[model samples]
Target chain A: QHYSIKEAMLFSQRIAQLSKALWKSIEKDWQRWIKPFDLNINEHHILWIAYHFKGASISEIAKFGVMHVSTAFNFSKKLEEKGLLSFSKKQDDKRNTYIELTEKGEEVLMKLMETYDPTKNAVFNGALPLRELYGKFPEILEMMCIVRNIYGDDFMEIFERAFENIKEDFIEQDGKL
Target chain B: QHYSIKEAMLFSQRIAQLSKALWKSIEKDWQRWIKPFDLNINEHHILWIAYHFKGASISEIAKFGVMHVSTAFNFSKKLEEKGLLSFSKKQDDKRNTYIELTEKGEEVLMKLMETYDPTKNAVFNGALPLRELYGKFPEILEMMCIVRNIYGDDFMEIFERAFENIKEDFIEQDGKL
Candidate 1:
C-alpha cells in the first residue's frame, strides 16, 4: 500500500523539528568551547575539515562538507584571525590558500580533549554520565570512533574500511543538503 | 584559586550566541510544521502540558517551564480554538481558567504515539540495519532509557523543582501582592 503525501510531509516536519532539537542540544556544549582563543561548532567543523586534509586548499574545505565555499572562507578567516590556524597562498599558485593547523591549534586541540567529558551535564540536559561508545554498538561506534576519535589522518583508512558496509549514498541523503 | 572574569564573560557570550543557533535550528523545523496546521514545537509543548495535567491552568503551565503566564494563556487560547481543550471559569474566583484535555486533545496525543518512532534510528528512519544506539555506550544508554521512560512526568517534576529551588530565600519567599 502507498502512503499519503500528508504522512510524508508530517514525517519530514517532525524530522526537521527533532534535528533542530539535536542541534540545540549539541550546541549547548559546543559553545562552551568557544573562548578568547577557540572556535564555535561551525568554526570547529571548518578547522576539522582543514586539519583533516592537512594543507588543503580553501575549496577542498568547502567541498569536503556540504557548506558553501564562502562559508569555508569566512570560517577560515575567523580561525586565522584567532591564531588557531594559518593559511598561505601556495608559492606555485597564488589562487589557492593552503590551510594548516597552527602550533597553537594543536595545543588547543589537546586541551579540547580534556573538555570533551560528556559527563558534564548542561542546564537543559539531564544527569547522564558519558560512557564509552565502543562497547555499546561495537560496529557502528567503531566507524564513528574511527573518524572522530584519532584525527590527523591516522584513522581514515580504518574508518573508511569500517564504513564500507554502510551504503554511502544513503547516509544523510534524506534531504539533509 | 582565582577565575578570570574575562573568561567568564566570554563563556556567557558564547552561550548567548549558540543559544541563538539553537533557536535558528528550531525555527527551521517550526516552519515545516506551521505550513500545515500553523502548529509549532511550542504548540506541541503546550499540548503536552495539557495532556499530562488533570487540572492544567495557564499559571501552572507557565510555572512548569521557562514561559511567561501570558504566553501560556495564549497557548491555551489556541488549543481551545482547535477544540482540543476544555476550560471552566473558577467559581470562587473569576481570574482562573481551570483546564482539562478535551477528547480531541487525547486523540492528538494518541495519534502522536501511534505514529512516532520514539526509538532512535527506527526502521522508518531509513538507515542501515544497525541496532539503534545499542552498542555505543551501555551505561549511558541505560541511563538515558531510565530518564526517558520517566521523561514526561519526572521532567515536569524536575522543571518545577528547579524553579522552586531558584527563589530568593527559598522558604521565606512570597508574592508581594
Candidate 2:
C-alpha cells in the first residue's frame, strides 16, 4: 500500500491534478500574504453588514454578519482610518454610530473589482463550463467510485458508529436525494 | 501532431526535454534574484564572480569569465558596502581585491535558499531521477528521429546529411568512417 507501483501509477496518472496543484501554489502564497494586516473574504461580509444594517451598534454588526463583537470593533476602526469612510453618532441613540463609505471607498472597490482579474475570472469559466470539469477532468473521483463498487474499504462496521458522531461540513445528507 | 493538446504536451510526451524545461524554470529564479539596491541578474553574477575568483581584479574576472569590466567593478563597490561580503586588496596588485563571503553574505544566501526550497531540492528529485531518467527514459533520441521522419522538424533532417545533405550540420570525413 505504501509506495507501491499501483499507488505510484494512481499517483502518476493523476498528472493533471498534480499540474494544477503546482500552478495554484502561486495563488496560495498570494492569498496568505493579505490574510493578516488586511481584509479578504470575511471583510466582504463585514461591508455587507454595514451597507444593509446602517446605524447598527457593535452587537448589531456581529448579529447581521457572523463575527465577534471585538472583531467588528476592530473592522470599524480600520475602515474609518483608511479615508474610504466616515461615521457619525445619532443624538437620539448615543450607542449608534452610523457607518458609510466616502467618495473614495466606492471608487476604489469599482477599480479593485475591475483589476482583480482572478485566474478563475477567465480560466475556469472556460475550463469547467458545466462544473463537469471537476466532475470528469479529475480522474480521482471516478477512480474512487470504481474501487468502492468492486470492494468496499469499509462497510456497516466501525465507520457507521464514527459517521453518526461526526459533524460534516458538506457530506451528502444520507441517500435521501 | 496538430496541437492535439497544448505545446508543452507535444514536448511534454518527450519526458526528458519537457521536465528539463520545468526544472530549468525552477532553478532560473534562484540563479536570478533581487537585492536591496534593486540589483539585477548581471549584477549578482558579478558579486558571485568576486567571491569565487578571490584576490582578482575586475579586468581579470572579466577575462577569466566572459563579463563586462564595468559591470564587475560597479557591483563590487555596492555589494562591499552592503556588507554581504568583504574584499581585501592584494599587496602586489593594488587594483585587485580578494573578495570572500563575509558572515553577512552567508546568511543572506541561506535565507534566500531556504525560501527557494522544495522547488529545487524536493520537487525536482521527485519528478525526475537523474541516472536512469535521462538518455534512456522513453528513449528520447530515436523518438526525436521518428518525429523528424514523420514531421521533419530540425532534428529529423540532420539524421545522415553527410550522405547528401546540403543543409545538415554534420559531414563524415571525406576519406574515412
Candidate 3:
C-alpha cells in the first residue's frame, strides 16, 4: 500500500498520545465505577463480543481484538471461572472452542453498559460526544471505510465492539441529547 | 472533579482499541523503516524530546512525555550507554540530573525526521486524512477539552508530545498543507 507515509505516521502519533491519555484516565474511572464488577476493559470486551457473537470462537475473538489466541483463551477461561461466560469445544474441531455469555454475564454486561450510558447512567453521567461528532460529519465515514479496507475486518470488529457498547447506550437514552 | 464520566468512559473504549491498532501498526512500520537505525518508536521520542529540550531535567522530561521518571531515566541511561546523550548534575539542584543529546543523537533525529516527511521522505508515500477529518468538524475538539479538564495537563502533555514530534517534522519539510 502506498501510504501517505508522513501523514499516516502523524495520524498514528496523534492517536497514540490520545489513546494513552484516555486509557490512563478511564482506568481510574473504571476502577471507581465498575471495579466491584471485577472486570477490566479487556475482560469486559470479552462479554461484549460474546453477548453479540453468541458462541464466538476463541480464534475469532483473538483476531478481532489486539491479543494473541492464548491471551484470549486465558481471559476467556478466567471469565468462565468467574461464571461470566461458558465455553464448549467443537466436536469435529476440538481445537476450536466457542464461548457464550451466561445469565450472570448478561446481567453484568447490562449493568456496566447502563453505567456507561450518559443519559440513563445511574452511576455516572455527562455529555456524550460520539453521536454529535459523527452526526455532524458523515464525511468522516469515508475515513472509516478507508481504514477498514486497509486494516482488515479485525480492526473494524474491534472498532464496532467499541462503537456498539456506547452506541446502544446512547440510543436507549434517546432524547437526552 | 466531576467526570463527563460516561462520555469519558466511551471515549476511553474507542481510544483503547484505536491506540492498540495504531501502536501495533507503527511498531511494524518503525521496524521496517527505522529499526536499521537502531531506535524504536519509544526511543525516537526520547531523542526527539532531548533534541528540543536541550539540558532538560529528568523530572521535566518525564512530565512532558508519556513516561514515568524511572522509565525515562532508564531509557536515558541506555541511550547514554549507547553514546547518544550525556547527563549532568544541576549546580543548584544538585540532586537532580539534566540530559542533553550528544552529536550522534542529533544525527539520528535528523535522519529519522528526513524519512518521515513527504518531500524529503524517500522511503514512503501516501495520503494523510487528518486535516480533512479535523477541519470539517471542530466538535471533536470539545471531546479533547473535556479530557484535558478531567485528566489534567500530564495527559495533555503526552498528547502534545505526540503532536509536536510530527508537527516539528512536517514544519522542517516546509509543506504548505
Candidate 4:
C-alpha cells in the first residue's frame, strides 16, 4: 500500500522531536549518575563493555558502545591513565587492541551499580504512570525495529545481551533488584 | 509501591539505546534529503519555524528547535547570508530580533516538501509493520509523557502544532497526502 508524504513526515518528525527531548533528559541524568565517579558517558560505557565481556577488543567496544574507534580508544586510554583499565595485545590476535577493567575499574563499576537510583532517572519516572496503568514499562518496540533496521541484528544482539546480563547478575536485596 | 532499580535501568537503557540508533539513521536520512538544497538540518529547521510562524524570534526558534540561542542566531545569520531569510526588529519590541522567510526560502521549502519520499525515511519504514498489524501508527505515548516531563507543556504545544499544520495544509494526491 502507498504511504503519504504526510504520514511519513509526521512519523519522522515525531521520532526526531521526541528523541531529542528524551536524549536531553537522559544525557543530564547519565552525567549526574556518573559524575561522582568522574567518568564521562563514553568512559563509563567502555568500562561497562570491559566488565560485560571480561575483556573486549577496542573494535568491539566501539561497536557495542555506538562510538567511533578513536572515541573508544581515547576514552579507554583515559580510563587507563586513571588506573581504571588496562590495555593489552593478545598473541593470538596482536593487531587488535584489547581492554580490561582494572581492579579499581571493577570497584568503581560496582559502586556505580550499587548507587543506581531509579527515582533520579527521568525516563524511569516518565514510564511510571504507564506501568501504574498497564503494569509494564513502555516496550518501545517501534523504536527497536527502527534501530535494528539501521544498525542490524548484531547491534540488537549486543543491546539485548547487556540488558540480559543486568537481569541475571543483579540479585534481589530487600525487595530491590 | 516500590520499584526495582532493575526496572528503572532497563527502561533507561532501552530508551537510550533505541534513541541513539534511531537518531543515527534519522541524521543520515535528513542530511540526504536536505543535501540537494544546500541546507543543513538546523538551517532547514529554522526555515520551517519561520514559515510556520510567518516571522519568529531567534529565542522562539531556539526554544522550539531544541537548540541553543547561539545556534539559532548563527544559523539564521547563515540563512540571511544565503538570501533565504530576513531579520528585523518590530518597533513594538525593538529589544528582540525576529526573522521572516524570504520568497526564496518559501520556494525551497515547498520544493523540499514536493520532493519528500517516505520510502527514504527509516523511521517511517520501520513503523510500517506495526501499522499494518495494528491498523495505526505507534502512539509512542510513553515517550510523549517522558518528553513532557523533561521539556514542559509549552514544548509539546509547539511540537503538536507543527504536526497539526502539516495535517491541515497538505492535501491527498494520487493516493499520497
Q: Which candidate is the best by DockQ?
A: 4
TM-score of each: 0.43, 0.26, 0.65, 0.86
After superposing candidate 4, which stretches have Cα over 4 Å from the reference?
A90-95, A172-177, B90-95, B172-177
Q: What is candidate 3's TM-score against the reference?
A: 0.65
lDDT of 2 by residue, B1-177 (tens): 111122211121122212222323333443443444455544454544444444356565454323456666667667777886666655354346555667776566435433333223332333333213342212223222223333234323222321232223222232111
* Clash count per candidate: 5, 1, 4, 0
Question: Which has the higher lDDT value, candidate number 2 or candidate number 3?
Answer: 3
TM-score for the A-chain in each candidate structure: 0.62, 0.42, 0.64, 0.89
Docking category of candidate 3: incorrect
Error of 1 at B36 (Å): 12
Tens digits of per-residue lDDT for model 2, A1-177: 112222222222133222222233323433443344365533544553453344357566554443566776677667778775667755344235556667676555434333332232222222232224234221222222222332234411222222332223112222111
Highest lDDT scorer: 4
Model 4 earns a TM-score of 0.86
lDDT of 3 by residue, B52-148 (tens): 5555777776655556777778887888888889888554542267888899888776676556543322111111343444442112344355456
lDDT of 3 by residue, A94-120 (tens): 237888889998888767655653333
Ranking by lDDT: 4, 3, 1, 2
Residue A156 deviation, candidate 1, in Å? 11
Clashing pairs in 1: A133-B136, A136-B135, A136-B136, A137-B135, A137-B136
Q: Candidate 2 has what TM-score?
A: 0.26
DockQ, 0 to 1 scale, candidate 1: 0.05
The alpha-carbon deviation from the true structure for residue B31 of candidate 1, after best TM-score superposition, in angstroms, is: 5.6
